[PDB]
Structure 1
Amino acid sequence: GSMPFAEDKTYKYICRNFSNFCNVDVVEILPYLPCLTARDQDRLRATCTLSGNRDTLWHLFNTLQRRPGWVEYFIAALRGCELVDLADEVASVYQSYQPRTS
C-alpha cells in the first residue's frame, strides 16, 4: 500500500502552524464532527488530563478518525467553524495529490 503522502505532509503542516489552528474551540472539532462515538469522547478526555490543551490539540486531530485520511473530516470542521482560509489551506495541499483506482 502507498502511504498517503498528503496526509503526512498536511499532518506536519497543521502541527507546525498549529498556532493559527488554536484560534478555535475543540468543540467545532470533536463533537461538531459528523461521525463520532462515545468511546472517542472518553479518549480525548484522558489526553486532556494528561498534560494540557496542547497534547489534546494534536491528539484530537489524529483522534478524529484514529487513522490517516482525517483531512476530509478536518476541512469539514473548518467549514463549520467559519474557517474559510484554514479550509482552503488544508483542502489545497491535499488536493495537490490524490490516488487513482485502476
Structure 2
Amino acid sequence: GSMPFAEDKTYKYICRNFSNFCNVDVVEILPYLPCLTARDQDRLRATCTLSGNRDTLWHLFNTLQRRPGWVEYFIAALRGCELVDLADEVASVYQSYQPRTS
C-alpha cells in the first residue's frame, strides 16, 4: 500500500521489543516474507553471515518499514517458520493500528 502510518508505528512498537525478536531466524523468514525487493532480502542474506540475528534483524525491520503493508505479510513470515508467538506479537500491534478497515 501507500503511506505507512500504522505500518510505521508497528516498526516503532516492535523496536521496543526488538529483544524478543532477537531470538528468531532472519534467513528462514526471507522466503516467507515477499513484501520487499529481492535485493532487500538478499542484503539480509549478506548481513546474516556477518552478524547473525541482531544486525540482520535490525536491517530487516529497517527495510520492512518502508514497505507500507509489510506487517500483514510479516505475520505470515514468523508464523510461516512456526514462530506463532512472534507473529502474535506483531498481530497484536496491527490489531490496534488499522486491523481491518473496509
TM-score (norm 2): 0.68
TM-score (norm 1): 0.68
Runs of 4+ in 1 over 6 A off after TM superposition: 49-52, 99-102
In structure 2, stretches of 5+ residues that fail to align are none
Using CA pairs under 8 Å that are at least 6 residues apart, name the structure with larger relative contact order, 1 or 2.
2
In structure 1, stretches of 5+ residues that fail to align are none
Answer yes or no: is the 8 Å Cα contact 1:28–1:81 preserved in 2: yes
Residue range with higher mean Cα deviation, 31-40 or 68-77: 31-40
Residue aligning to 1:51: 51
Residue aligning to 1:8: 8
Corresponding residue pairs, total: 102
Distance change in 2, residues 1:34/1:45 (3 Å): closer
User: What root-mean-square deviation, in Å, do the aligned CA atoms of Structure 1 and Structure 2 show?
Assistant: 3.6
Distance change in 2, residues 1:22/1:51 (3 Å): closer
Deviation at 1:76, TM superposition (A): 0.6
Question: Percent of pairs identical after alignment?
Answer: 100
